[PDB]
Amino acid sequence: GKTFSNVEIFDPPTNYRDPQVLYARPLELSDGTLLGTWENYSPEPPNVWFPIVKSKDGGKTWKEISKVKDTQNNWGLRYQPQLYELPRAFGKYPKGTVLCSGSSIPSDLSETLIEVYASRDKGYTWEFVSHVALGGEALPNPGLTPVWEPFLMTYKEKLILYYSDQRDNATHSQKLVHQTTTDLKKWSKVVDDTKYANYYARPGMPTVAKLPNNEYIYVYEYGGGPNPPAGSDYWFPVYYRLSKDPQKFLNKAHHQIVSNDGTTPAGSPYVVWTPYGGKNGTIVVSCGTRSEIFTNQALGDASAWKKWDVPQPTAYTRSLLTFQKDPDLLMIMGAGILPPAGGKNTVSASVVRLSEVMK
Numbered sequence: 483g484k485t486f487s488n489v490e491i492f493d494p495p496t497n498y499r500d501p502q503v504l505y506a507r508p509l510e511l512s513d514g515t516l517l518g519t520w521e522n523y524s525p526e527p528p529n530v531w532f533p534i535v536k537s538k539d540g541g542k543t544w545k546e547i548s549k550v551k552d553t554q555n556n557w558g559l560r561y562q563p564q565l566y567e568l569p570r571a572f573g574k575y576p577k578g579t580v581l582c583s584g585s586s587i588p589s590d591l592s593e594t595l596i597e598v599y600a601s602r603d604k605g606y607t608w609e610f611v612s613h614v615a616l617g618g619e620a621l622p623n624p625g626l627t628p629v630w631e632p633f634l635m636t637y638k639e640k641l642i643l644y645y646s647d648q649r650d651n652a653t654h655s656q657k658l659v660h661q662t663t664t665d666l667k668k669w670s671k672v673v674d675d676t677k678y679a680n681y682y683a684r685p686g687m688p689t690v691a692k693l694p695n696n697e698y699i700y701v702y703e704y705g706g707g708p709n710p711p712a713g714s715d716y717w718f719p720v721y722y723r724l725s726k727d728p729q730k731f732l733n734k735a736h737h738q739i740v741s742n743d744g745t746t747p748a749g750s751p752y753v754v755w756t757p758y759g760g761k762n763g764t765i766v767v768s769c770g771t772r773s774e775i776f777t778n779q780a781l782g783d784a785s786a787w788k789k790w791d792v793p794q795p796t797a798y799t800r801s802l803l804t805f806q807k808d809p810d811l812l813m814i815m816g817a818g819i820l821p822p823a824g825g826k827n828t829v830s831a832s833v834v835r836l837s838e839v840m841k
């Protein structure tokens with residue numbers, strides 16, 4: 483069988499710094515290998531690194547094969563890792579190169595620097611490729627200037643790196659932006675993806691999926707979004723936008739995700755699309771405050787979101803992966819909750835079938 487529930491990937495040493503682990507990310511390579519990583523809050527020195535685990539049995543068993551280290555700044559690779567496999571060449575990096583992007587940050591949290599590292603051997607070694615975006619102090623506070631949370635996706639001849647940006651600090655507490663590259667070395671001018679006139683709004687945490695009608699869905703948490711629930715003055719509801727050109731989300735209408743029973747997912751979302759489920763396939767969304775998955779088999783029609791229980795627990799920026807050879811299979815991967823985590827975070831995953839979950 484290919485399904486499983488709550489398989490532990492990593493349990494941190496107990497002296498790791500709260501939250502110990504956070505921010506799990508998976509990747510399927512073209513050969514069917516899975517890689518995984520997370521924020522690893524080790525005692526420093528040595529400077530923090532992103533661990534790389536590998537599974538050859540679809541996620542049932544794992545072992546660490548390498549570490550992505552900061553070779554440039556003597557700071558560490560600290561926050562918000564993201565794994566991605568090149569589907570075509572970009573300059574001297576061929577199809578099948580594995581990228582790991584993430585934020586290099588000194589221990590004192592005084593600066594943020596989104597980096598790209600690359601592996602030419604399917605995750606065993608790593609090379610620094612380029613600096614993408616420099617920002618200020620790594621606290622999510624209005625008026626500071628950090629950058630955060632890279633997400634990578636190819637569009638035609640460009641590679642796009644989407645992220646969260648506090649550098650327009652007199653006009654937007656945070657906004658969402660991207661840069662593009664054709665050689666992985668030279669990055670374009672910053673392009674705005676989503677921003678709000680209310681200074682205190684904090685759209686954040688962008689992920690993107692391609693739909694079979696040639697549109698793309700862009701998903702984010704809308705910090706400061708309307709209608710906070712009772713006893714809250716500020717919340718992070720999951721919103722999305724749809725676009726044929728994934729460089730042009732800024733001008734598209736926004737949509738809150740609300741399931742048929744009225745459930746309003748909030749926090750640190752993650753989107754994928756699978757061909758499973760008919761001609762429109764199935765859009766699958768997780769959020770970081772509930773355990774259910776949210777699905778849409780109507781190309782993002784705002785009236786068509788459904789909610790389903792799964793065995794994997796609630797986690798901050800819980801992530802998703804669809805399997806190339808069986809679109810019915812869905813991996814759900816997490817690394818626990820925001821600090822204070824009480825020593826209890828672990829990295830774990832489940833693999834479910836949508837054909838079974840969606841009843």
Ligand SMILES: OC[C@@H]1O[C@@H](OC[C@@H]2NC[C@H](O)[C@H]2O)[C@H](O)[C@H]1O
Nearest residue numbers: 505561562621622630646685686687
């Ligand atoms: O990943 C570690 C985490 O990052 C910091 O939060 C960043 C904010 N998350 C939502 C917004 O998009 C961004 O400002 C936090 O301090 C750490 O725990």
Ligand SMILES: [Mn+2]
Nearest residue numbers: 490492493494
């Ligand atoms: Mn243990």
Ligand SMILES: [Mn+2]
Nearest residue numbers: 493494825826
């Ligand atoms: Mn433990």
Ligand SMILES: [Mn+2]
Nearest residue numbers: 510511512806
């Ligand atoms: Mn593949």
Ligand SMILES: [Mn+2]
Nearest residue numbers: 773774790791
């Ligand atoms: Mn439920």
Ligand SMILES: [Mn+2]
Nearest residue numbers: 483485835838
């Ligand atoms: Mn079964």
